[PDB]
Design a protein around this nucleic acid. Sequence first.
DNA 1: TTTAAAGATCG
DNA 2: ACGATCTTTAA
Length: 249
Amino acid sequence: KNRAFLKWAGGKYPLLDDIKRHLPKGECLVEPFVGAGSVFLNTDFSRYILADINSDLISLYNIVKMRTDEYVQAARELFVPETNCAEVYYQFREEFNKSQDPFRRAVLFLYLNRYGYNGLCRYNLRGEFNVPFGRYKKPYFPEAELYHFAEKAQNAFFYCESYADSMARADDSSVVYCDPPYAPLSSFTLEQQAHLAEIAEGLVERHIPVLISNHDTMLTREWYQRAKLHVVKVRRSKKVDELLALYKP
DNA sequence: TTTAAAGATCG
DNA sequence: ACGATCTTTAA
Ligand SMILES: Nc1ncnc2c1ncn2[C@@H]1O[C@H](CSCC[C@H](N)C(=O)O)[C@@H](O)[C@H]1O
């Protein structure tokens, strides 16, 4: 199982085996919520359509793809012992929020992801990254993970857009996998959760397969009722299980 | 300016 | 999911 170079929510590494089992074969893979791209990095499709609402995330991916060697040499210089302290971290975080250069922002973004608190990605209403210092012993520089991403990305297109627009890029030879933000166990609204299901039912009706992963709750059962859903027992957090909704035509 | 409740901030 | 301290919202 290949590892992503970013710390990110929805790593789904223990679920990668289960996703691949229920993921239909196809020419292209559409991923509306790509995030760290663990599925993209652990599958074998000829083409990829990868999208996310996070503009920093998509901008980083393009730069890693198009300017690989340049980016790696610049980002590696930030992973040295003297950058592992609060004062330097908050200046880098400020430099990121004031930078207008996509390349420089992409470099700092990896630093903030690996040195930041719990690898979180948080913004205020001004679009300013405000995650505090993480205080780790020795943050890992994912050089191998970076180069592997860049190679894999040669057959991929990245778009910063909502799920509705990205899924509309799907043709007959494409498969769609969806990993939306988790459903409430007790932001991404409930309407969007149900909307995603509606669009999914549209694609199948049109001969495009769709696979959706989420928690196993009462709401997810109802949203994904028109799909041959399967369950997997991760069983921890009450104990909650993961639901895999498959819209096979 | 008053005001009570809600939302936003960021370590 | 935390919390002291900001800003916001409406009459
Ligand atoms: N409305 C939207 N349209 C497209 N992408 C979205 C979106 N809302 C959130 N996303 C992206 O989708 C990704 C989901 S990763 C979330 C995985 C898992 N469900 C969890 O909640 O932990 C995030 O990186 C986020 O940037």
